[PDB]
C-alpha cells in the first residue's frame, strides 16, 4: 500500500522540503485549475482530495487500476475526477510537485462566500489533514474547528483551520 505514493522528489532549490517527510522539523515562518488527471511523475508525497472530508488518492493507471510503481512510470496518474462528489458540491485536491511547489485543483471561486481551490472551503478556513503543515506551512497558527455537516446526503466530520 506504500508503493502507491508518488515519490518523485527533487529539491533543486535546496529548500529542505523533502526533509520534513522523513525527519521532525517545525515550520519556519520567515517567508510567511480543474481537477482532472495529474501525471504521477510530477508528484512528490501524498495526494489529498477534499470531498468535504480529506481523502488520500493513490497511484492508478488511466482505467483506475491501482499501480505500485511509486509513480515512476509515465502511465502512473492520479484520477482526481473520479473523487468528485456525485451531488455537485464543492470539490478540490492538493499535493506537492517534484520541486517543492504546492499545487491545487478546483472550480474557480464563484464568489467570496464560495469555496477555494485546494482544501480552502472558506477564504479564511482550510480543511485539516495530516499533511496540512507540509503543503501549507503558513497555516500553523490557524485555529481548528470541528465541523459536522450533511452534503448531498452524506455526513462529513472534519476540522477546519481558520484564522
Amino acid at each position, epitope marked *: 500500500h*506504500i*508503493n502507491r505514493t508518488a*515519490l*518523485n*522528489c*527533487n*529539491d*533543486s*532549490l*535546496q529548500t*529542505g522540503f*523533502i*526533509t520534513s*517527510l*522523513f*525527519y*521532525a522539523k517545525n515550520v519556519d515562518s520567515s517567508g510567511c485549475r480543474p481537477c482532472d488527471v495529474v501525471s504521477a511523475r510530477t508528484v*512528490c508525497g501524498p495526494v489529498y482530495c477534499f470531498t468535504p472530508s480529506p481523502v488520500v488518492v493513490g497511484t492508478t493507471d488511466k482505467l483506475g487500476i491501482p499501480t505500485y*510503481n*511509486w509513480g*515512476e512510470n509515465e502511465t502512473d496518474v492520479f484520477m482526481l475526477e473520479s473523487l468528485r462528489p456525485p451531488t455537485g458540491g464543492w470539490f478540490g485536491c492538493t499535493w506537492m510537485n517534484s520541486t517543492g511547489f504546492t499545487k491545487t485543483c478546483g472550480a474557480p471561486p464563484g464568489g467570496p462566500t464560495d469555496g477555494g481551490s485546494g482544501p480552502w472551503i472558506t477564504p479564511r478556513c482550510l480543511v485539516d489533514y495530516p499533511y496540512r503543515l507540509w503543503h501549507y506551512p503558513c497555516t500553523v497558527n490557524f485555529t481548528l474547528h470541528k465541523v459536522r455537516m450533511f452534503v448531498g446526503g452524506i455526513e462529513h466530520r472534519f476540522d477546519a483551520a481558520c484564522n
Partner: antibody
Amino acid sequence: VQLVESGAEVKKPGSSVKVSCKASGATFSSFIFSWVRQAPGQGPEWMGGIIPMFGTAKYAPRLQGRVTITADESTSTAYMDLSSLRFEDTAVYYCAMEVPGFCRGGSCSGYMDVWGKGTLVTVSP
Amino acid sequence: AVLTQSPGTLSLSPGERATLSCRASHSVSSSNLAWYQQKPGQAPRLLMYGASRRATGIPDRFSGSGSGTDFTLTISRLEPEDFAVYYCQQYGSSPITFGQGTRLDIKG
C-alpha cells in the same frame, strides 16, 4: 539525534561481519540510514542505504552482491552485513543520517548530517 | 559522477584565504554537492550542503559556491582548527560519490 554502533571486530578472510546502528532522537521508521566506510588513508565510500518504512534497500554497485542491509523496527536497530570478507575490506564502518536531496522509487539520496562514531573492522588471520 | 579535488595538498598560513576545488566528471544536477571536514581519528563533520548552504553550527568564515562541474569551498580567514582533510560529496546522481580529499596543512 545520535547514532551508536557495535564495537570493533576482527575477522578472518572469507568470513562475514554485522554492524548495527541505533538511532536515538528521531523516529526509526522514517529514518534514512546510510552506511559509509573509509579505508586507512582513503576517502569515504558509500556502501548502501535503508529506509525501513519503505522496505527498499539500495546498495553500491561495487559490492552490491556482498552486502545486505536490514532494519529491525522492533528494537530500532539497522544492520549492515558484509560477507566473504577480503583484506581490502579493513576499514572504519560508519552509519549516518542521510538528508534527502532527491527521491525516486522508494529510495532517496543526499548528504550525511549526523555520523556514527565509527566501527573499526580489521580482516586479519 | 566522479569527483576530483584540487589541490591534493594545500599549504597556507593562519589568517590566509583558502580555496578548495571539487571537479566532477559530469555535471551535478541542481548543485547537489556537500563538503566535509575530517580531523584525524574522527568522523567527517558536515560543513556545507547544496554547494553553498552552510550547515548549522559552522562558522561564518566557511563559504561555498559553484555549480555544474566546478565547485569551490572557501575559508576566508584560516584558524588553527581549520587544518584538516576536506572531502566533497555529490548527491545529484543515484550512486553518491565522494572526492579523494584535499589535505590543508601549514605553510613553511
